[PDB]
Design a protein around this ligand. Structure first.
Ligand SMILES: [Ca+2]
Ligand SMILES: [Ca+2]
Ligand SMILES: [Zn+2]
Lengths: 483, 129
């Protein structure tokens, strides 16, 4: 009728009737049949459906990874001839795990299947599909053991990427990497589907990194996993056909990524022209800086910083330069840790993140350091608030284009106190400043005595009784000037 | 359909000729279990006409089974839907010279609801037409 391919469907059907059972010589049919409860998960509804199935499972596993072993299984269709029963791989954790891990793994795979369908909806050159996976429970066995179950797929198995930065370069395929990057953008940076692997574009055992990093098991490295992906990820023709903004890599990182651009140009997957554009979000710091006008992408850049410092990306010395590049990108995206760290670094001050990295002193770097420290102070970092109070007070680390301002210094001291130097120290410093006045602040004997008495009480809290007595005396001295 | 005709003939002759009640008796005595549905469906009854009706049934059930097996050929993960990736994998594994756009078109033709996949209802429609 309206189908000019029915000949193709039927040709495939009969050809398949002639193909042999790839597991025939394992004689799973001869195995004693076992009862199992199959638990299946619908990811759109979040709903589980459990039914009863009959399975014949091999007594010994045929494969063993680091975490799981795999059993050849035949399962009868509740919709006859065991010889024609469908072949399944049944996976079990070698070491005993909490039962909920199996159901969480199913949730992970079914979510990734939803993401494959979303990617397909954007009319990609090659479509993808994450194989359904469910659980079978063998209640008639000691301890009612659980297994993952997936259909057996004939073909060359390939890991196209890992959940930790690996990318397959030998005959590099575009579609898996484009799919991972697509999930990153289309989810609004809330997740990325990696560990893309399977036969052709039938994927299995995928992993998902989420911003929270709490779901989808111990393989969810969170923003760290996103960073591992984007450190190695070279955007391809599919990424561009869908509008995927590249990840802002360092110039050196970009060169390392481009080392395979000739392979990408020689890849086999060619675009069709029908591809469609990606709530989504851009993987570029520019469009994200506009979006912000609090950012997962900034957390990814910060994770890149820490992986550079930790030697993860080290092949020679760790990059340092690229670490700073990504620290700046994280800062401009509002990661308070990055803003504090860059404010300390540009001010030549001891810093925690990238501690052994010292930036060259420039006057422009002095202004940058104080600006970052004031931003951090206005954002609530107490350390920066104290450094800015000290800068406005004494001029230490003050930007040359700014002036000592004891009004501003008092503002920041008191913001610190209202939130590793003791508190009586800052209270007494405010007291001194109001005792003499200066740098735009007028003498205030009454307030100086009030703050000296607050400092005396705080000293009393810290057991510094004799210091408290000195502070009470200083308060009396401040008040003695009045009248 | 010969020795099976002999089995059907013996089953009927046990009731010899036939009535509706008897029809249910003979269907159950042949292993079947007709719902009052199929009873009133037909819906007395001779043996040539009984052979004809039983042949009809057998044909319809065999065609249902054949189409379900055909679907199992392509629904590689048994989720109830033939994705484009699945049909591509199958066409490759069975040695067919269809391109990727051709596989997308094979799916599109049968995709009545437009979800980019072929459920079993759409598969049957494609096969029973
Ligand atoms: Ca399927
Ligand atoms: Ca459909
Ligand atoms: Zn990309």
């Amino acid at each position: 009728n309206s189908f000019h391919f029915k000949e193709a469907w039927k040709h495939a059907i009969q050809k398949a009737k002639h193909m042999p059972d790839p597991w025939a010589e394992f004689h799973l049919e001869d195995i004693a049949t076992e009862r199992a409860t199959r638990h299946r998960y619908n990811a759109v509804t979040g709903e589980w459906l459990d039914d009863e199935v009959l399975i014949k499972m091999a007594s010994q596993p045929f494969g063993r990874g680091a975490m799981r072993e795999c059993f050849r299984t035949k399962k009868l269709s509740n919709f006859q001839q065991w010889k024609g029963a469908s072949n399944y791989v049944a996976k079990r954790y070698i070491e005993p795990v909490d039962r909920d891990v199996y159901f969480e793994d199913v949730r992970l795979q079914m979510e990734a299947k939803l993401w494959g369908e979303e990617y397909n909806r954007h009319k990609p050159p090659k479509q993808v599909d994450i194989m359904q996976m469910c659980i079978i429970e063998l209640k008639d066995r000691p301890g009612k053991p659980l297994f993952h179950l997936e259909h057996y797929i004939e073909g060359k198995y390939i890991k196209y990427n890992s959940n930790s930065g690996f990318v397959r370069d030998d005959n590099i395929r575009l579609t898996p990497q484009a799919f991972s990057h697509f999930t990153f953008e289309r989810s609004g940076h809330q997740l990325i589907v990696v560990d893309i692997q399977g036969v052709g574009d039938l994927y299995t055992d995928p992993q998902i990194h989420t911003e929270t990093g709490t779901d989808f098991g111990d393989g969810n490295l969170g923003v760290r996993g996103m960073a591992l992906f984007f450190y190695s990820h070279a955007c391809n023709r599919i990424c561009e056909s869908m509008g995927l903004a590249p990840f802002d890599l360092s110039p050196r990182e970009r060169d390392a990524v481009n080392q395979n651009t000739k392979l990408l140009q020689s890849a086999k997957t060619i675009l069709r022209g029908t591809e469609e554009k990606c709530l989504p979000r851009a993987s570029a710091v520019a469009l994200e800086v506009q979006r912000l006008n609090k950012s997962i992408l900034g957390k990814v850049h910060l994770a890149m910083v820490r992986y550079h410092e930790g030697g993860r990306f080290c092949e020679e010395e760790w990059d340092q330069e690229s670490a700073v590049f990504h620290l700046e990108h994280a800062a401009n995206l509002g990661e308070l840790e990055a803003i504090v760290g860059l404010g300390l670094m540009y001010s030549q001050l001891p810093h925690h993140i990238l501690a052994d990295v010292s930036l060259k002193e420039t006057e422009e770097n002095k202004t940058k350091g104080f600006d970052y420290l004031l931003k951090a102070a206005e954002a609530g970092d107490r350390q920066s608030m104290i450094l800015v109070a000290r800068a406005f007070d004494s001029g230490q680390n003050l930007s040359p284009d700014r002036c000592q301002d004891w009004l501003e210094a008092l503002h920041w001291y008191n913001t610190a106190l209202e939130m590793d130097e003791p508190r009586y120290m800052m209270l007494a410093r405010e007291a001194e400043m109001l005792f003499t006045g200066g740098y735009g602040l007028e003498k205030d004997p009454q307030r100086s005595g009030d703050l000296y008495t607050q400092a005396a009480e705080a000293a009393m809290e810290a057991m510094k009784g004799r210091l408290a007595n000195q502070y009470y005396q200083k308060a009396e001295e401040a008040w003695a000037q009045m009248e | 359909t010969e020795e099976q005709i002999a089995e059907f003939k013996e089953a009927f002759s046990l009731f010899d000729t036939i009535t509706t009640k008897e029809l249910g008796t003979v269907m159950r005595s042949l292993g079947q279990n007709p719902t009052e549905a199929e009873l009133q469906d037909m819906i007395t009854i001779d043996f040539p006409e009984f052979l004809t009706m039983m042949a009809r049934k057998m044909k319809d059930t065999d065609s249902e089974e054949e189409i379900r097996e055909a679907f199992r050929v392509f629904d590689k993960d048994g989720n109830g839907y033939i994705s484009a990736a699945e049909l591509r994998h199958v066409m490759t594994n069975l040695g067919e010279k269809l391109t990727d756009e051709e596989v997308d078109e094979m799916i599109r033709e049968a995709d009545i609801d437009g979800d980019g996949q072929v459920n079993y209802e759409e598969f049957v429609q494609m096969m029973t037409a």
